[PDB]
Every structure is written in structure tokens, then in C-alpha cells.
Design a protein around this ligand. Structure first.
Ligand SMILES: [Ca+2]
Length: 305
């Protein structure tokens, strides 16, 4: 029985994500790399391998926005079509699916706020009628871009647009310093239904100092969802950090915090789950899973156990 058939319409109560029966529920899965670069993996066959064999219950569609990255602003119809294919695939498989407005070098989400509103309004009219879709409205605010000054104002307007159409599907809002500054949200939280706040980390870079920030946020009532994390270090030059990854996943499991690994592609970098040449349509043998991918697959299987 599929994840969506078993869990239905999710709800946020306090810090906690719950399923349709009010039971605590953890989403676990993996993100595409940028759809403009590694979109070949965002298909129903790859996703079925993730569901059936890896035991993932969520996928994330990383739609870069920055036109210099060949993001949505440079080629909106072509990228929107990829997002739709990804969402339709997830719907057919009964998986949850995150539509990620993947800001990064465009470090202030306000830069493309009008485009974000129109895009998410469309996504909500198309997909807001079933439980699957999750709207991630600003991947990683960074630089001099704070909760009070820039992120919350952006989020309030985009959330009002979404909530005028889709009253209940989850919305996840990024936080300052590449979605680290979750401890700033409680100073002025958003008064809408089913909102959670992003925490991102790399196992080779972040440790207890960032877990303390998460705990502080949780203690003030801020719901956290890890929409992106890596097994490598921030630069990616350290190889993989599996004992540090295990420590982080133990922490997230203890708090029933949902998590999404980066990334499902075959780029020659430590955080990529697949080895170069891996089949876009799934069924990956061990030869084409990287050290990171082998670990993530095993952890997902173990969690369902
Ligand atoms: Ca809905």
C-alpha cells in the first residue's frame, strides 16, 4: 500500500508532522539535483525504484530559479514541464512530492517573488486537490537575508497566494544562512495552516552547534523539516562522512523530523547517489550506486524495518 494511501492528508500540529489519523509521521527520501542539469532522473521509473526498492516515501524536484544557472527565470515553460512530469509520476506511485523553488545564487527570494507567486498558484490549482504535493517556496535564503527583514515578508505573500487555493497541503519555508537559522522563526512565526521551516546540513561540515539551533527552534514551537542534507562536506572535497551522517539521522529520527538527501544524480561528486552512467530509468545495481547512495538506500530500507 502506497505512502499516500496509508497516510493521506498530512497536518502540522505544533512542531509535529502527523498523518490523517493524527499519528506522528516521518517522510524520508531524496532530491533531484537541478532539473535543468540532471532532469533525466525525474521520472516515474526512477521514482518507482525509489518507492519499491529504496523504500523512500517522498521525492524532491529541485527547480533552480536563477537565470544564470539556466533556472526557471531563463526557461520557465521548459522547467515547469519537467516539474509536472515529476509530480504526475509521484501521484501515480502514491508518493509525496516536494516542488522546490530552488533559490541559491539568487540569495534573496524577493528578487523573483512575482514569478514565484504565479508559479505556485498554478501548481496549487493543478495539484492542490490531492495530498501528494508539498510546496517548498525558497530553498536557501543566504547572505544578508534575514527572517524578519526579507524571508518572512516573501513567505507571507506567497503563502497567502497558495492558501487561497490549497488550504492544507504542506508549505515549507527556507531559513537564513542556507536554511540554518531556524532559531529566528519563533520571533515572528507565520499564522497559517500547515507550515514548516527548512533545516539544511552537510554531515562533513555541521554538527552539534547546528543541532543546538534546531533544538532551540523546536523548544519555541517551530516545526522543522530537513528538505536537503548531504553526506559530504559543504565543498564536497572530503569524500563521504558516514558516521557523522548516522549521528545526524539518529538525531532527526529521535525528533521524528522528515528528511531528504541530496542528490539523485550521477555527477562525479561525493554527495551524488549514483555513479556516472547510471540508468535514468532506475533499477540501479550496486555498481551504479555511489558510497553515498549505498548508505542512503540502506538507511531508508532500515527505517521501514
Ligand atoms: Ca489540498
Amino acid at each position: 500500500k502506497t505512502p499516500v494511501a496509508k497516510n493521506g492528508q498530512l497536518q502540522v500540529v505544533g512542531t509535529a508532522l502527523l498523518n490523517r489519523d493524527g499519528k506522528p509521521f516521518q517522510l524520508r527520501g531524496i532530491s533531484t539535483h537541478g532539473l535543468q542539469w540532471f532532469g533525466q532522473f525525474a521520472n516515474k521509473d526512477a521514482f518507482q525504484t525509489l518507492r519499491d526498492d529504496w523504500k523512500a516515501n517522498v521525492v524532491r524536484l529541485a527547480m533552480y530559479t536563477d537565470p544564470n544557472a539556466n533556472g526557471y527565470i531563463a526557461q520557465p515553460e521548459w522547467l515547469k514541464a519537467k516539474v509536472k512530469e515529476g509530480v504526475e509520476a509521484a501521484k501515480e506511485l502514491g508518493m509525496y512530492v516536494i516542488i522546490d523553488w530552488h533559490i541559491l545564487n539568487d540569495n534573496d527570494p524577493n528578487l523573483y517573488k512575482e514569478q514565484a507567486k504565479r508559479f505556485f498558484a498554478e501548481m496549487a490549482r493543478e495539484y492542490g486537490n490531492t495530498p501528494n504535493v508539498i510546496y517548498e517556496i525558497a530553498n536557501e535564503p543566504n547572505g544578508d537575508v534575514t527572517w524578519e527583514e526579507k524571508i518572512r515578508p516573501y513567505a507571507d505573500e506567497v503563502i497567502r497566494t497558495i492558501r487561497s487555493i490549497d488550504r492544507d497541503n504542506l508549505i515549507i519555508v527556507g531559513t537564513g544562512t542556507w536554511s540554518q537559522d531556524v532559531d529566528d522563526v519563533a520571533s515572528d512565526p507565520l499564522p497559517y495552516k500547515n507550515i514548516m521551516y527548512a533545516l539544511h546540513f552537510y554531515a562533513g561540515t555541521h554538527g552539534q552547534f547546528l543541532r543546538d539551533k534546531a533544538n532551540y527552534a523546536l523548544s519555541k514551537g517551530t516545526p522543522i523539516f530537513v528538505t536537503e542534507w548531504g553526506t559530504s562536506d559543504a565543498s564536497g572535497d572530503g569524500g563521504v562522512f558516514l558516521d557523522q551522517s548516522r549521528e545526524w539521522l539518529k538525531y532527526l529520527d529521535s525528533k521524528t523530523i522528515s528528511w531528504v538527501n541530496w542528490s539523485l544524480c550521477d555527477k562525479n561528486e561525493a554527495s551524488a547517489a549514483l555513479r556516472p552512467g547510471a540508468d535514468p530509468h532506475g533499477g540501479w545495481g550496486d555498481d551504479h550506486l555511489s558510497d553515498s547512495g549505498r548508505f542512503i538506500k540502506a538507511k531508508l530500507i532500515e527505517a521501514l524495518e
